Amino acid sequence: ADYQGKNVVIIGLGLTGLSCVDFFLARGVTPRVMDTRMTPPGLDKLPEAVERHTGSLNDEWLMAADLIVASPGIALAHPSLSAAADAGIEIVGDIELFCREAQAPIVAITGSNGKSTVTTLVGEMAKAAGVNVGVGGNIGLPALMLLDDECELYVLELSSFQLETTSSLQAVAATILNVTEDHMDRYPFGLQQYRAAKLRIYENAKVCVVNADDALTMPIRRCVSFGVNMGDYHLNHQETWLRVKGEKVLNVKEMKLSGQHNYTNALAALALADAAGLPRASSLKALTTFTGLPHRFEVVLEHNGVRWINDSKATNVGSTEAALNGLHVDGTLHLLLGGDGKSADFSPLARYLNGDNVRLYCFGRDGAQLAALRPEVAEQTETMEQAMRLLAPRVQPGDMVLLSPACASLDQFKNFEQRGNEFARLAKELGSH
Ligand SMILES: CCCCOc1ccc2cc(S(=O)(=O)N[C@H](CCC(=O)O)C(=O)O)ccc2c1
Numbered sequence: 001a002d003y004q005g006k007n008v009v010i011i012g013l014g015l016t017g018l019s020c021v022d023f024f025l026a027r028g029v030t031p032r033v034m035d036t037r038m039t040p041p042g043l044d045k046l047p048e049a050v051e052r053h054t055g056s057l058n059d060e061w062l063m064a065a066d067l068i069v070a071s072p073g074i075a076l077a078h079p080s081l082s083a084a085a086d087a088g089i090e091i092v093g094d095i096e097l098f099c100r101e102a103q104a105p106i107v108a109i110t111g112s113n114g115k116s117t118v119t120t121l122v123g124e125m126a127k128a129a130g131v132n133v134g135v136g137g138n139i140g141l142p143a144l145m146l147l148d149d150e151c152e153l154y155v156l157e158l159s160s161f162q163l164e165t166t167s168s169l170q171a172v173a174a175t176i177l178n179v180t181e182d183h184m185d186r187y188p189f190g191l192q193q194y195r196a197a198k199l200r201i202y203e204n205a206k207v208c209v210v211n212a213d214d215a216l217t218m219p220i221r222r223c224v225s226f227g228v229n230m231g232d233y234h235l236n237h238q239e240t241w242l243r244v245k246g247e248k249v250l251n252v253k254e255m256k257l258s259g260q261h262n263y264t265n266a267l268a269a270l271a272l273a274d275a276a277g278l279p280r281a282s283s284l285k286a287l288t289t290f291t292g293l294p295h296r297f298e299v300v301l302e303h304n305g306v307r308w309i310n311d312s313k314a315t316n317v318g319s320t321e322a323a324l325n326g327l328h329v330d331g332t333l334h335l336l337l338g339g340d341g342k343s344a345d346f347s348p349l350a351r352y353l354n355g356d357n358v359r360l361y362c363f364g365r366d367g368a369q370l371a372a373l374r375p376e377v378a379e380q381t382e383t384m385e386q387a388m389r390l391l392a393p394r395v396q397p398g399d400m401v402l403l404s405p406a407c408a409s410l411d412q413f414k415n416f417e418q419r420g421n422e423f424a425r426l427a428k429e430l431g432s433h
Helices: 014-025 059-064 079-086 094-101 115-128 160-164 190-202 260-275 280-289 317-324 347-352 367-371 384-394 416-430
Strands: 008-011 032-035 052-054 067-070 090-092 106-110 133-137 153-157 173-176 208-211 224-226 233-237 240-244 247-251 298-303 306-310 333-338 358-363 378-380 400-403
Touching: 008 014, 014 032, 014 094, 032 059, 059 079, 067 079, 079 090, 094 160, 106 115, 106 190, 106 260, 115 133, 115 153, 115 260, 115 280, 160 190, 173 190, 173 260, 208 260, 224 233, 224 260, 233 260, 240 260, 247 280, 260 280, 298 416, 306 416, 317 347, 333 367, 333 384, 358 367, 358 384, 367 378, 378 384, 384 416, 400 416
Parallel strands: 008 032, 008 067, 032 052, 067 090, 106 153, 106 173, 133 153, 173 208, 208 224, 306 400, 333 358, 333 400, 358 378
Antiparallel strands: 233 240, 240 247, 298 306
8 A cells, every 4th residue: 555645643642553653654654643541652752743632532633634543442433433434534453554564474363362372372383383473463562563574474463443444454364262242332232243343354364263162253154163072173082182173183281271261272273373384293382382471360479378360361251251160279269350341241250159269359440340249258449459458368278369350450550461460569479478
């Protein structure tokens, strides 16, 4: 694509908004930037020659634009964007701009849970094969920061929000790992509308990879499948093995990751890597070396008979359910829940919270709603720190402390990483004498 002479408006700063700014400048186009936040991240990094408008949208700028580059963090349904669309003004996001330029095949991964794990895994499979790979998108570096004509493969995590503004993706391999309720604050037509956004990832994909166990991951109108008991890629319990069409490929005792949902993450990653043409041996090797992502069921302290686990990356109900389903606790589970629940129904969690060995410590915007899952075993505080200091004295040898909050952190924190980092610091303070 050619942007010379166009009036370009970018909505949303941050590293992504900045990567869009840098993208245009390097192409001889000075964009203008707006953000609904008064002091958006990276404002101080924004070059002085770039005009900016913060604290609201600017309809004069939007309606004058030839191209609007919209952060995934702003709804296309926002009246100002709806007005621009009605006017025939083209709206894209960073992923769209990237796809128009990329000169290597793209593996594209979305889903409500497991997408960063599968993304990072496919990256490691490529690295083990000696492929120059760029890994990022919705995690790590924004996609435009990966663009390099020496890159031989791109592996992108894409959110439902990014997908809504992307039209030119033709993935070599694409998957929706699963679809469970999330982002309902952005999808007023409910679960099918959210699903529709993710289904975009399959458009013009060379191979589609679906979850045999989740019908919502399948196109409305074959794909390769992965699953637990069925699928082209499936599990065999003997010990557990990864299998491809009846052939054993890996005894999961060689994996550092554990738990059934990580075994299906492994299958999804292998299916994508196979479709991308990566050698099978090096892909299997990566499965054995990968240790996990920070904030993803991460043991931050195991001391004095107590495991403290940072699962701050659990920003939705289905992710917290993945941590709880099949969870082994010797003594009492001390579960930290809270933040901005994005209008989620938390009741699917209730079935894991029965018995004499669970306590709930509920905080942030939706703390009262979370406490209400089982009031008799729940405490509510304003902050996660308060919750930690409340629970710490009650922790006994055999117990587990688990931050798996089922909510976005954005009511009280910059992001789930800062929430995880704060938890870890507090765990280390409170978990020794
Ligand atoms: C003009 C836009 C101003 C707001 O900027 C944003 C950019 C990206 C965004 C991405 C998302 S998001 O939904 O993709 N990610 C959050 C992350 C939660 C957490 O880290 O605790 C979530 O899954 O709930 C939400 C809001 C966003 C807002």
